[PDB]
Amino acid sequence: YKDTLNLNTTTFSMKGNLSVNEPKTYAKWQEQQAFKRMQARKDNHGDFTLHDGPPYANGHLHLGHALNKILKDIVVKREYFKGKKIYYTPGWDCHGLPIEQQILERLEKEKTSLENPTLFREKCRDHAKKFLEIQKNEFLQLGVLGDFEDPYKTMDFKFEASIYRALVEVAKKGLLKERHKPIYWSYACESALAEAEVEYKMKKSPSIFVAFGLKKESLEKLKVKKASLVIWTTTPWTLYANVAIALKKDAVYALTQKGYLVAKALHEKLAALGVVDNEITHEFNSNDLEYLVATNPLNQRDSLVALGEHVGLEDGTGAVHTAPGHGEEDYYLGLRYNLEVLMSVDEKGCYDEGIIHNQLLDESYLGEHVFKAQKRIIEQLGDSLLLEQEIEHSYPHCWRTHKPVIYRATTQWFILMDEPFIQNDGSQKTLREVALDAIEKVEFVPSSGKNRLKTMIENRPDWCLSRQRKWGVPLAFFIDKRTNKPCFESEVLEHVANLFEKKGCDVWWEYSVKDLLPPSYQEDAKHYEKIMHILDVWFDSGSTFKAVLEDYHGEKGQSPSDVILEGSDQHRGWFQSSLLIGCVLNNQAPFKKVITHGFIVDEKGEKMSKSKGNVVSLDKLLKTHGSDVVRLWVAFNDYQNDLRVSQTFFTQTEQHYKKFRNTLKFLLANFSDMDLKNLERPHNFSPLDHFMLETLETISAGVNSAFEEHDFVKGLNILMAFVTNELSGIYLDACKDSLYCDSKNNEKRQAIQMVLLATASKLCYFLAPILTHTIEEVLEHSQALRIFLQAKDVFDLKDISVSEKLHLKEFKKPENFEAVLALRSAFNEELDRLKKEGVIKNSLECAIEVKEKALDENLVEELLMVSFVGIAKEKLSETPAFTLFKAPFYKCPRCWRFKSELENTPCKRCEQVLKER
Ligand SMILES: CC[C@H](C)[C@H](N)C(=O)O
Ligand SMILES: [Zn+2]
């Protein structure tokens, strides 16, 4: 009788063959310009702008890039399917050391050089172009949709002009100022750096305690025979630049029997270390030591005893070796006392002629790198070296050369944080104040991200903008030699900006000063000289809101954006640079909302690097699992924290994907034969039908609410529980007899099919942002779904009203299945017990007599899948709720239910179906 059943099959395959079929889908969306079609949708209602943070145009995509673009894609697709016009122009960060360092390294490896600035910039620009195309196509292989054929590029000439015009706005508001002070200096790239370009890593260091003997006249003033202040330092390379020893104000300093002078609060620690001897002979107040003078044991130079602002007593000695050329707090102390700023370390981190001309350090050190010289310096200290250790400490390194940085007093350009400036509304505020106010108006997901960014703004220094490399946007101002000050005249600045817009920034190197000035100024061209520093690339990316959202007047999205979505490492990076520049231009953040994610890490939670051998390639991952599995893995996991890549976790995701896919296959298979005239007329739905429609509505609200708050785990868990439990476990098991053995003309079967159609419809809508290829495939294989949803393809999906499309009555009282589902669970646990004893094989062999008479007997029979409700003859078991019997019928050879009065004879329902004309 098997061939007399309803076939109930679909062409939608159980196997996804994802690595074969996904490229076909994505190629189609590119060929057909699906993102453009999305933006053009005629019934768009509302707008949604996600502003892409631009990856650097260097190298192939990392797993973190895929995580990022997939999450953006889910968020964007969610808004599209809610009915909005979407703005999502992806972009690329094309300048900076992330590109330039690769060129510098390749030149070195080729044993070649390239000193021509235009030709050098050309090699960098060609490298960004190459990898922009590579990353673009790799992004498209994730199934993401955006304006990838018209992306934004910081190397576009109009973009270079937009960045420069952002800088112009900073300068005209009085926040762009030169400062001279020690800052981060990367000797390996001969450039200043700021915080976002520094990576702190553990590093071993010498750690030394050094005695500076007081001069004879100072010992006479203090009335002791011997006294030497002891300092602690990890940088013997700066001892040549000492000008002072800074003490804590109004603090007691102990003089030992051997003549060492240290903070009394630290004497116990230092004597236990063996730095000084244990016997204290005299105590002195630091206020009485100020303006004594000591002698540097390295070079015999005077060192002033000074009082520092906040000298610490937790480490060291309480006497701080002070080198204004190499320490920012040292520098301010030096100026307060009108001391020399000694700085004889060149741009490559090597001692220069200054050590000879000023007698700071022996001539032999000329040309030596400061880190290389330290062993010989420590040996030169002789008896003044009281103790030498080796320690480990967290130390700043250059983000691209990975070499340790140093600090060098230098003249650079800064955006000031504590300089009051005129607000757009006419009030007066500092940038720090504006940025803190602006942070409070932004929504952070998770909300903990707010305090992370806030704390950085509270604590950050002035922002050094000027870099000494060639690949970037120049700080393209002239210094008037007649004034020694920059020219911020609007006519000059807009003349340069317009040149940049048309020709790009190459002209700043190529053109003469005269050719770069408005005609009104060319007679005075001899008085002007170009600043040749370039902008921090974090200023480039900080300006994307201006260059993309503002300068295209909303065609690429609104300013402020509705959402930005990046790694939580961008609090130190793009979030902060965009926040600061937004606050100068607009006095608010250029984003309304920040969503963050973690890092992709290995099975042990560790970062992937080539030096570790734990790198999983994005290509290998997509080839193994398929992009819809990778996308589901992202969505079905706690992406705000680090995501670990392991076989075990991807296997779990594949099982989820399989369950979703097998469920959609079953639904499609079991309404494939439905007559489409059913779609227009209403149906009489059973209580179980209604229970499922009501359950589907309740869980649909919960999936949607979870997805709205970007908690895709919570929503997918709700969806998966529904498909596993109420759908597959209860409804589809109860309906299989009718779906396969009732007549196609049976109105109860047709009503089940409509429920299955409504259920697949909701599954398609909710999974469309995540498994877009798979839902596209579902629609491709189901004509009934396409008619019912009025959908040509996945991009025509909308959130449908099941009530309206099935013609449900307005005030229908919901079903209450609590009692009958409690019976079902009790029956199934009693039935499990009888299968243990070998008494019966399945529920169909049973009759049940329910002790509660209020229950609907057909629904009991449906849900428990017994063949008979009522009393029979062979008792199997008894509970307080029900008695089970052997069903007093034969098994029907067609439907396998125990409903046949005669052996091997079709039951009454089957007999009619087999007879039907
Ligand atoms: C948001 C990205 C930022 C701007 C930077 N290009 C990076 O890849 O880290
Ligand atoms: Zn039958």
- The DSSP line for 527-596 is GEEE---EE-HHHHHHTHIIIIIITTTTTT--SSBSBEEEEGGGGTTHHHHHHHHHHHHTSS-SBSEEEE
- Best of 51, 56, 67 for a ligand 1 pocket test (most atoms within 8 Å of beta carbon): 56
- Judge if the beta carbon of residue 573 lies within 6 A of ligand 1: yes
Q: Identify which of 159, 541, 543 to mutate to test ligand 1's pocket (most ligand atoms within 8 A of the CB).
A: 541
Tokens of 36: 């453009």
Angle, vertex CA 186, rays to CA 174 and CA 54, nearest 5: 65
* Separation of first and last alpha carbons in the chain: 17
Nearest residue to 591 via CA among 610, 611, 613, 576: 576
Q: Which residues contact 575 (CB under 8 A, 6 or more apart)?
A: 453, 564, 566, 594
154 Cβ inside 6 Å of ligand 1: no
CB 49 within 8 A of CB 87: yes
Q: Pick from 440, 454, 449: which is nearest to 641 by CA?
A: 449
d(CA 781, CA 765): 16
Q: Which ligand is nearest to the CA of 575?
A: 1
| Closest ligand to the CA of 1 | 2
Strand partners, 559: none
**Beta carbons of 290 and 248 less than 8 angstroms apart:** no
> Which numbered ligand comes closest to the C-alpha of 890?
2
For Cα atoms 620, 625, 630, give the angle at the middle one, nearest 5 degrees.
95
Element (H, E) at 822: helix 818-836
| Whether 245 contacts 339, CB under 8 Å | no
Distances (CA, A) of 574 to 168, 474, 634, 832: 20, 20, 23, 59
Token pair recorded at residue 819: 């009692």
Residue 98 in contact with ligand 1 by CB distance below 6 A: no
Residue 567 alpha carbon, nearest atom of ligand 1: 1
Rg (CA), the chain: 38
79 CB within 6 A, ligand 1: no
Listed residue (821, 819, 822, 843) closest to 831, CA to CA:
843
Q: Closest ligand to 844 CA?
A: 2
Helix (H, G, I), strand (E, B) or coil at 76: helix
Q: State if residue 545 touches ligand 1 by the CB under 6 angstroms criterion.
A: no
List of E strands, 191-315: 191-192, 198-214, 228-233, 244-248, 252-256, 260-263, 280-285, 293-295, 302-308
Of 66, 59, 197, which is closest to residue 128 (Cα–Cα)? 59
Is 380 in contact with 363 (CB distance < 8 Å)? no
Q: Of 582, 438, 560, 577, nearest to 93 (Cα)? A: 577
Per domain, the residue ranges of the chain are: 2-12+647-806, 195-408, 476-532, 818-915
- CATH number 3.60.20.10 is the correct assignment for the domain at 2-12+647-806: no
User: Distance between CA 94 and CA 153 in Å, rounded?
Assistant: 7
- Distance from Cα 10 to the centre of ligand 2, integer Å: 25
Classify residue 511 as left (phi > 0), alpha (psi -120 to 50) or beta: beta
Q: Using DSSP, state whether 223 is helix, strand or coil.
A: coil
816 CB burial (10 A radius; 0-12, 13-18, 19+): exposed
| d(CA 196, ligand 1 centre) in Å | 11
Task: State how beta strands 890-891 and 882-886 pair.
Answer: unpaired
Three-state SS sequence of 100-157: HHHHHHHHHHCCCCCCCHHHHHHHHHHHHHHHHHHHHHHHHCCCCCCCCCCCEECCCH
Instruction: Using the mean position of ligand 2's atoms as its centre, give its distance from the Cα of residue 903 in Å.
Output: 12
Cβ neighbours of residue 17 closer than 8 Å, sequence gap 6 or more? none
CA separation for the pair 404, 406 (Å, rounded): 7
Topology of domain 195-408 in CATH is: Isoleucyl-tRNA Synthetase; domain 2 (3.90.740)
DSSP single-letter state for residue 729? I
Ligand closest in space to the Cα of 913: 2
CB burial string 856-892: b at 16+ within 10 A, e below: eeebbbbbbbbbbbeebeeebbeeeebbbbbbebbbb
Dihedral angle computed from the Cα positions of residues 295, 299, 303 and 308, in that order, rounded to the nearest 10 degrees: -120
Decide whether any atom of ligand 1 lies within 6 Å of the 54 Cβ.
Answer: yes
Question: In the Cβ-directed half-sphere of 548, how many Cα atoms lie within 13 Å?
Answer: 34
Tokens coding 770: 């995540």
Name the structure determination technique.
X-ray
Give residue 571 CA to ligand 1 midpoint distance, Å: 11
Residue nearest to atom 9 of ligand 1 (CA): 55
Q: Is the CB of 53 under 6 A from ligand 1?
A: yes
CA distance 600 to 637: 12
Q: Cα of 177 to ligand 2 centre, how many Å?
A: 90
User: What resolution in Å is listed for this PDB structure?
Assistant: 1.9
**Length of the chain, in residues:** 917
Q: Do domains 2-12+647-806 and 818-915 have the same CATH topology?
A: no
Side-chain-side CA neighbours of residue 815 (13 Å): 22
Element (H, E) at 707: helix 687-708
Among candidates 842, 819, 818, 816, which has minimal Cα distance to 831? Answer: 842
Query: Which runs of E-coded beta strand occur in 272-318?
Result: 280-285, 293-295, 302-308
Beta 85-87 vs 302-308: how paired, if at all? unpaired
Cross-strand bridge partners of residue 591? 561
Nearest ligand 1 atom, CA 98:
6
Ligand 2 centroid to Cα of residue 819, in Å, is 29
User: What is the rounded CA–CA span in Å between residue 738 and residue 749?
Assistant: 6
Work out the number of other CB atoms within 10 angstroms of the CB of residue 529: 12
Cross-strand partners of 877: 884
Ligand number, closest to the Cα atom of 543:
1
CA contacts within 13 A on the Cβ side of 730: 21
Distance from C-alpha of 537 to C-alpha of 548, rounded to nearest angstrom: 16
- The residue whose CA has the least distance to atom 8 of ligand 1 is 55
| Residue 53 Cα: closest atom of ligand 1 | 1
User: Do residues 614 and 646 touch, judged by C-beta distance below 8 A?
Assistant: no
**In angstroms, what is the span from residue 464 Cα to ligand 1's centroid?**
18
- For 71-103, give one letter per residue: b (16+ CB within 10 A) or e: bbbbbbbbbbbbebbbbbbbbbbbbbbbbbbbb
CA distance 277 to 271: 5
CB 703 within 8 A of CB 719: yes
Residue 193 near residue 405 (C-beta atoms within 8 A): yes
d(CA 728, CA 41): 36
Whether 541 lines ligand 1, by a CB cut-off of 6 Å, is: yes
Question: What would you measure as the largest C-alpha separation in the chain, in angstroms?
Answer: 127
Contact 791, 785 (CB under 8 A): yes
Would you give the distance in Å from CA 877 to the centre of its chain?
60
CA distances, 827 to each of 451, 734, 820 (Å)? 54, 15, 10
- Per-residue b or e along 369-396, where b marks 16 or more CB atoms closer than 10 Å to that residue's CB: bbeebbeebbebbeebbbeeeeeeeebb
* 3 state SS of 41: coil
CA gap 383, 374 in Å, rounded: 17
How far is ligand 1, taken at its centre, from the CA of residue 537, in Å? 10
Query: Given ligand 1 and candidates 51, 60, 93, which is best to mutate, with the most ligand atoms within 8 Å of its CB?
Result: 93
The alpha carbon of 572 and the centre of ligand 2 are apart by a number of angstroms equal to 70
Which atom from ligand 1 is nearest to the alpha carbon of 569?
9
User: Ligand 1: distance of its center to the CA of 595 in Å?
Assistant: 15
Give the SS3 label for residue 653. helix
- The protein residue with its alpha carbon nearest to ligand 1, atom 7, reads 55
Whether 672 lines ligand 1, by a CB cut-off of 6 Å, is no
For 331, 738, 857, the CA distances from 441, given in Å and listed in that order, are 37, 57, 59
* Residue 144 near residue 73 (C-beta atoms within 8 A): yes
Would strands 244-248 and 319-322 be described as parallel, antiparallel, or unpaired? antiparallel
Q: Which residues on adjacent β-strands are paired with residue 404?
A: 397
Q: How far is CA 881 from CA 74, 383, 745, 849, 885, in A?
A: 49, 96, 37, 9, 14
Ligand 2 centre from 729 Cα, in Å?
22
Judged by its nearest atom, the ligand closest to the C-alpha of residue 570 is: 1
64 pocket-lining for ligand 1 (C-beta < 6 Å)? no
CB of 90 sitting under 6 A from ligand 1: no
Residues 907 and 894 sit within 8 Å (Cβ to Cβ): yes
DSSP 850-877: ES-TTS-HHHHHHHHT-SEES--SSEEE
Taking alpha carbons only, the member of 735, 684, 766 closest to residue 859 is: 735
Q: Which ligand is nearest to the CA of 742?
A: 2
DSSP 369: B
Residues 6+ apart with CB under 8 A from 448: none
Q: How far is the CA of 761 from the centre of ligand 1 (A)?
A: 39
Helix axes 687-708, 712-721, angle to 10 degrees: 170
Residue 600 pairs in a beta bridge with: 643
Measured CA to CA, the distance from residue 422 to residue 428 in angstroms comes to: 5
Q: How far apart are CA 28 and CA 50, in angstroms?
A: 24
Ligand 1: which atom is nearest the Cα of residue 544?
4
Q: How far is the CA of 246 from the centre of ligand 1 (A)?
A: 41
Residues forming a β-bridge with 285: 252
Question: Which residue's CA is the nearest one to ligand 1's atom 1?
Answer: 53
Of 171, 160, 145, 138, the closest CA to residue 59 belongs to: 138
Best CA proximity match to 98, nearest among 53, 131, 65, 66: 131
**CB of 718 closer than 8 Å to CB of 695:** no
Pairing of strands 564-567, 593-597: parallel
CA distance 454 to 480: 39
Atom of ligand 1 nearest to the CA of 93: 6
Coil, strand or helix at 181:
strand
- Token pair listed for 218: 């100072």
Which residues does residue 86 pair with via DSSP β-bridges, in sequence order?
A: 48
For ligand 1, is residue 93 a contact (CB within 6 Å)? yes
Helices (H), 276-369: 328-336, 354-357
> Hey, what are 822's tokens?
């409690």
Strands 875-878 and 882-886: antiparallel
CB atoms within 10 A of CB 489: 15
- Can you tell me whether residue 74 is helix, strand or coil? helix
Helix, coil or strand: residue 363: helix
Question: Which ligand minimizes its atom distance to the CA of 889?
Answer: 2
Mutation to probe ligand 1, out of 63, 69, 570 (largest number of atoms < 8 A from CB): 570
**Fold of domain 818-915:** hypothetical protein PF0899 fold (3.30.2320)
- 808 burial (CB, 10 Å; 0-12 / 13-18 / 19+) is middle
